[PDB]
Each structure stands twice: as C-alpha cells, then as structure tokens.
C-alpha cells in the first residue's frame, strides 16, 4: 500500500509539489527514520507478532520471488513464554504459518485442510518431504540472561527459576507430543553476556538433552570487558557445556 | 453364592437399560461375582466410586481401566496400538466438556472437525468399547461398580455416566448399594433444577405440593429407567439364610467359636447366638430368648460378626461374668446408635443408677409406658 501511495505520489509531483505538502513528506519520512533507529538500536508488539501473519510473512520473503525458495534451511529463533498456553499460542502460530506458506507451493492431501490444534498442524506436515523448494524449518527457543538481583541465595538464583521454568514447559509439551522434536531442534542461550557467565546453564542444557533437544547453542565473545574476558568465556563454555560434535556457539567474537 | 451364581445366568443372557442392580458384605458379594466372570464377556476391576479424588469423571476412571487393559493385551502380542491412540487422542481432545465451568467458544470449531454432529463424547466412548472389544475378542465389557455408602453423592455422577455414555449394547452396568439413597440424591439434585426465586417466592402449601408431586414422579420415573427392575437383584439375608426357628436352614452356615475348631466343633450359627444371649442375658431357652435372636439374625453381617467374634474372643481370654463380657460388646457393637440415644456414655458411671434412668430414657423414647421395662427389641427403630 505504502509503495503504491508514494508511487502516486511522486508521479504526481513529477514536475513540481506544494511546499506546504512537501514539508509534510520530509517530517514523515524523518519521523520515521528517528523511530527506526530507535527501535534498532533497542514486549507487547512482539506479543502483536503472535499471529499466522507475521511468520507466514517471514517464510514468503525467505523464499524468493521464484517457484524454488531463494533458502534451503531456516532457523526460527523464538523467544520462550512463561505461560504454557503462551507458549503453545506461539508454538501453533509458527507451525501454522509454515504450513500455510507450504501449501503455498505444493498440492497434496493436507489431512486437515483447515488445522486448529499443534496436533493437527503436525498431522498436516509430517506428509512434507524435503525436496527443497520451500524452506526447511528448525526451531529454537532464546534464553536470556538478566543481571543478578541484589539478594538472593546464590547468583543468579532467580533467573534460574525462571529458566528451569520455561524448560519445564517446554519438556512437558515434549511428553505430550514427542512428534515436535522433529521440529525443535535446539535450544540457545543469547543475550547480553556479562548479566550471567554460561555455566547457569550446563545443567540446563542436560537435562534439557536428557528431554530429547538435539543440539545447543550459546552466545559468546561477542560483548566483555576484556578480549582476554571474553577468551575465557567461550573457553570455559567449550570445556563446561553438554555441547557435542557439530554443535555451534555463536558469536566468538573474542 | 447361589445369589451371585444366578446374577450371573442373569447378566449372561443379557449380551444375548443394561444395569443389574444390587441391594443391600455387598463388595464380598461383588468381588466373588466378578471372580466368577473371571459367552465372552470381560470383567473390569470394581469401581470404588468413594474411593476417588472429588475431581475425575467415571467415564475417565473407566478409560484408565481399559487404558491398562487394551494396552497389555496388547503388549501381549501393530496397527491395533496405532489406531487405539487416536481414539485416545480423540477423548483427551473432547474431554473438556465434562470440565469446564463455562463454554470456550474456540471448542466450537473444534466441534467442527471430522457421525451425528459435534463432538459427542459419547459416541466417542462407543468407538472405544467397538474397539475394545473387538480387540480383546470379547462380546462385551462388565463396569462393576461399588456402593457408595460411605459417599452416596458421587454415586450421581456415575448415574450420568451411565445415562450420557452407557447407553452401549456391548456394555453392562453392575450397580451396588440402597436404592433409597439413588432416589434420594436424584431428588435433591432435581429440587436444584428448580429457580431459587421459584420456591423463594412460592413458599405455600399448594404450589410446594404441586412441584413435590412433580419431582417425586419424575425421580420415580428416572429411577424406573436407569434401574429396570427386571436386572435389580433382591439379595438373600443371614436369617433368610438360616433356618426362622428350625423349621428352616438351606445351607447351614455353621461359625467358628474356639481357636481349635477342627471344623467339626462349628456350633452352628443360630445357636451359638442363642448361647450367647442366654448365658449373657441368664435368658432361660424358651419362645421370648429365640424370638430375640431372630431380632439379632437380622443386623448387618459386619456388625454380627464383630459382636459375635469379640464374644467367644473375651470369653476365651477371661477363661483361660457372661453378662458383662457381652455387655461390654453391646457397647461397641450400638455405641453411636447408643451415643445418639443420648444415654450413658462413660464406662466409669455405670453402677445400677444410671441404669434406671436409662431405662427410663429408653421406654419414654420407644413410648410405649405398658412394657417398656421388658425393653423389648420390638421398636420400629433399630436404634
Ligand atoms: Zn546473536
């Protein structure tokens, strides 16, 4: 809509344009290059992102404007709720906006033509087969890092709760149904660095594999106070967490 | 024994509503009908309806059973497994409805998926039982359910299982318990249908007799439905069972009084009560004492046999007074009957003064004033 409009309207002023008009045309393009800086340089409008549009969007520019998708494997990185209904709210919007750009290109029995439970949607997509036209997608969920509080038992201690929380959700969904596993695969830690070193999350991540997650992630090297720091920090998670062959950091900008 | 033979004759030429019924020790009763079932036809574990938490439907308590059930004749031994679980699924999915306190309005187009319309938890029940048993090779299932004396109000919810998913030809119903208190409990939640500015309103003679009249013939009606009498089973007593005054006596039951009791001492059943009331009561052995038994032949089988096991017990332990020895056993054997007489209650006050007023308390509460003294157990009340 947007392009068309200023399409029209440039045509329009192709010879020439009221001051007054015009004026408005730079305080609006000014306004909004400030606010997106702003934002890029950066809960509720991430909350607005929780519909089969937003994602289905995402997965139609992920594949190009030809038959074959412009990328052979997505990473969907979504940041985890403390509510299972929240998380499951999200869970099925993604999958539901996968199957939708799916269908988007190919023609076969769906099952369910109009899916409403995770259940369904993963009765739609197990008939998916990769033969590369449209995206392959592999999901994981954030783990972010706040900086200790000023009491507590031991470091970090709440934000623990709050982690084994959000991964207590996520195993339970697991139990209820295994079939996701083929679709979260992995889980990251990201975050500013220095509000909590990677260890908090060994554990974590065990059990976290133990509950069937295949691969980890965790970022590192990327902030610190010293480049030396920041050495440390990837080393220490090389040598600390459960991570296997061909698992993969992060950042290590260090 | 023959009761619980004849029961199952009964259910048996039934697969050939579909709830036998019977009155009311009762779970023994029930336990042996059920061994007896172990024509194929399969038994479930008794339903204890009082022994579960305030929050499960019947109908998930008998989808755990065949759960196990299916599961390990299964594992005994595919597709079958596979097409289980979404019947499975399919119940977790529509389970909600019993649950919840109010309508989600998203359970609407989940009623829109895909044979009547919706999502009828009971024509998913019925897929299931089709399943079961045509897994387990069986003509149909038993659903045994117990008493629920101990909690006569849960006993409801397994009527409205019972009526809203049992409604199955491959499925048969075995109630147990007193009627009185179904009748009850139907009553009382069929009072609550009612508008509380209704009867707020209407509190005079007329309308009140009018909606009793209403209510009593629709809890009649209802019972007359849910417990076809044709199924009810009767049910034979201790005293029906043992010989009126000796004119009597199918199958001797015969009991147990001393430790050796080589099977050959049994000193009957009626006359081993009589001993004990006669030699506890100095009774003589004449028409009034046996009469007094007959009164005694009645009382619940627990109860008997408690007072008749604690009898012979402390005779035995104090010989290595009867009255008191069976004294002290009436006691234990009427204490709350007695504790709601409102007689006497400490043991430590009894002396024969307190004995006088109480028997005054008993003749003025039996009224009678003619031959109360004679504290005949002819009362009405079994208080
Ligand atoms: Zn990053």
Redesign the interface.
């Known amino acids: 809509s947007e392009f068309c409009w200023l399409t029209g309207l440039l045509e329009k002023w192709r010879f020439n344009a009221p001051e007054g008009l015009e004026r408005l045309l730079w305080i609006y393009l000014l306004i909004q290059n400030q606010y997106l800086t702003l934002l890029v340089q950066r809960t509720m409008t991430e909350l607005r992102e929780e519909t089969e549009k937003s994602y289905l969007s995402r997965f139609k520019h992920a594949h190009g404007a030809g038959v074959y998708s412009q990328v052979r494997y997505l990473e969907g990185r979504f940041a985890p709720k403390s509510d299972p209904n929240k998380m499951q709210k999200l869970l099925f919007s993604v999958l539901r906006g996968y199957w939708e750009y799916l269908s988007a290109h190919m023609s076969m029995e769906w099952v369910?033509e109009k899916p409403?439970?995770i259940?369904?949607v993963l009765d739609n997509l197990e008939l998916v087969e990769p033969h590369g036209k449209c995206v392959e997608l592999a999901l994981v969920p954030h783990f972010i890092k706040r900086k200790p509080k000023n009491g507590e038992a031991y470091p970090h201690a709440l934000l623990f709760k709050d982690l084994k929380n959000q991964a207590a959700i996520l195993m339970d969904m697991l139990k209820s149904e295994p079939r996701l596993t083929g679709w979260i695969r992995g889980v990251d830690a990201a975050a500013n660095e220095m509000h909590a070193p990677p260890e908090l999350f060994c554990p974590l991540f065990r059990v976290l594999a133990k509950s069937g997650i295949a691969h980890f992630t965790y970022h590192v090297g990327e902030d610190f106070p010293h480049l030396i720091s920041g050495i440390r920090s990837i080393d220490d998670a090389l040598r600390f967490l459960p991570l296997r062959n061909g698992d993969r950091l992060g950042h290590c900008t260090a | 024994k023959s009761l619980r033979d004849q029961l199952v004759e009964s259910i048996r030429n039934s697969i050939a509503r579909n709830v036998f019924f019977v009155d009311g020790g009762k779970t023994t009763f029930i336990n042996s009908v059920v061994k007896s079932l172990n024509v194929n036809i399969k038994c479930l574990p008794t339903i204890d309806p009082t022994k579960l938490p305030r929050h499960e439907p019947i109908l998930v308590t008998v989808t755990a059973r065949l759960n196990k059930m299916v599961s390990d004749k299964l594992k005994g031994y595919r597709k079958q497994k596979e097409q289980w679980q979404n019947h499975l699924a399919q119940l977790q999915r529509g389970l909600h409805l019993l649950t919840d306190k109010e309508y989600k309005p998203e359970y609407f187009s989940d009623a829109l998926k895909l044979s009547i319309g919706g999502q009828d938890l009971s024509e998913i029940f019925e897929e299931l039982v089709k399943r079961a048993c045509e897994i387990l090779d069986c003509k149909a299932i038993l659903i045994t359910f117990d008493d629920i004396d101990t909690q006569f109000d849960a006993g409801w919810d397994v009527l409205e299982s019972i009526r809203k998913f049992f409604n199955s030809r491959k499925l048969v119903v075995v109630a147990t318990g007193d009627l009185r208190l179904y009748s009850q409990l139907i009553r009382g939640k069929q009072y609550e249908n009612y508008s509380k500015t209704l009867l707020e309103q209407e509190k005079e003679s007329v309308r009140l007799a009018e909606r009793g009249y209403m209510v009593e013939h629709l809890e009649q009606q209802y019972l007359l439905k849910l417990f076809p009498v044709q199924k009810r089973i009767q049910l034979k007593t201790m005293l029906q069972l043992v010989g009126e005054k000796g004119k009597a006596g199918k199958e001797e039951i015969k009991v147990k009084t001393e430790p050796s009791m080589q099977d050959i001492d049994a000193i009957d059943v009626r006359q081993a009560i009589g001993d004990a009331v006669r030699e506890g009561l100095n009774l003589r052995e004449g028409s009034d004492a046996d009469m007094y038994v007959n009164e005694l032949l009645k009382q619940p089988v627990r109860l008997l046999m408690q007072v008749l096991q604690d009898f012979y017990t402390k005779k035995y332990h104090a010989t290595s007074s009867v009255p008191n020895l069976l004294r002290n056993a009436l006691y234990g054997s009427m204490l709350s009957n007695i504790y709601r007489a409102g007689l006497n209650y400490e043991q430590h006050r009894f002396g024969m003064d307190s004995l006088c007023k109480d028997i005054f308390t008993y003749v003025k509460q039996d009224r009678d004033f003619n031959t109360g003294f004679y504290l005949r157990p002819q009362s009405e009340s079994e208080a």
């Open positions: 369910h409403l439970t259940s369904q």
